[PDB]
Swiss-Prot record:
This is Regulator of G-protein signaling 4. Inhibits signal transduction by increasing the GTPase activity of G protein alpha subunits thereby driving them into their inactive GDP-bound form. Activity on G(z)-alpha is inhibited by phosphorylation of the G-protein. Activity on G(z)-alpha and G(i)-alpha-1 is inhibited by palmitoylation of the G-protein. The lineage of its organism: Eukaryota, Metazoa, Chordata, Craniata, Vertebrata. Phosphorylated by cyclic GMP-dependent protein kinase. A lipid is attached at residue 45 (S-palmitoyl cysteine). The gene is Rgs4.
Length: 129
């Protein structure tokens, strides 16, 4: 990783997740905190963010909601107690902003802890000696 990209990681979460090595390092970092379900959820959210037809969001929303947001889901995603209800409420009116609120929490979740850890992580320090 060039010194130019690591500095960007300190300027915005998107740079860290938008870099080929940041993704690999970020995905590996999630494994350290076992938060890899978040990137899988992010990938599902991206597909959700690309579908602009509210008639197609319902089908996948229930599958994603039932899989990642079901309280009995084996790999529940770490989110606040109110965000999960919001996705369930989107069932009545599925919109493109239904998973945006959850995606925002994933960004804030890793940005609040992963970023601070990334700057102090051994991989980052190795890249930033």
């Amino acid at each position: 990783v060039s010194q130019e990209e690591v500095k960007k990681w300190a300027e915005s979460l998107e740079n860290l997740i938008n870099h080929e090595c940041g993704l690999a390092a970020f995905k590996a970092f999630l494994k350290s905190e076992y938060s890899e379900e978040n990137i899988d959820f992010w990938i599902s959210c991206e597909e959700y963010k690309k579908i602009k037809s509210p008639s197609k969001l319902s089908p996948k929303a229930k599958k994603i909601y039932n899989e990642f947001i079901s309280v009995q889901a084996t790999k529940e995603v770490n989110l606040d107690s109110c965000t999960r209800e919001e996705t369930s409420r989107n069932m009545l009116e599925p919109t493109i902003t239904c998973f945006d609120e959850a995606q925002k929490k994933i960004f804030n979740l890793m940005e609040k802890d992963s970023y601070r850890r990334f700057l102090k992580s051994r991989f980052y320090l190795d890249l930033t000696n």
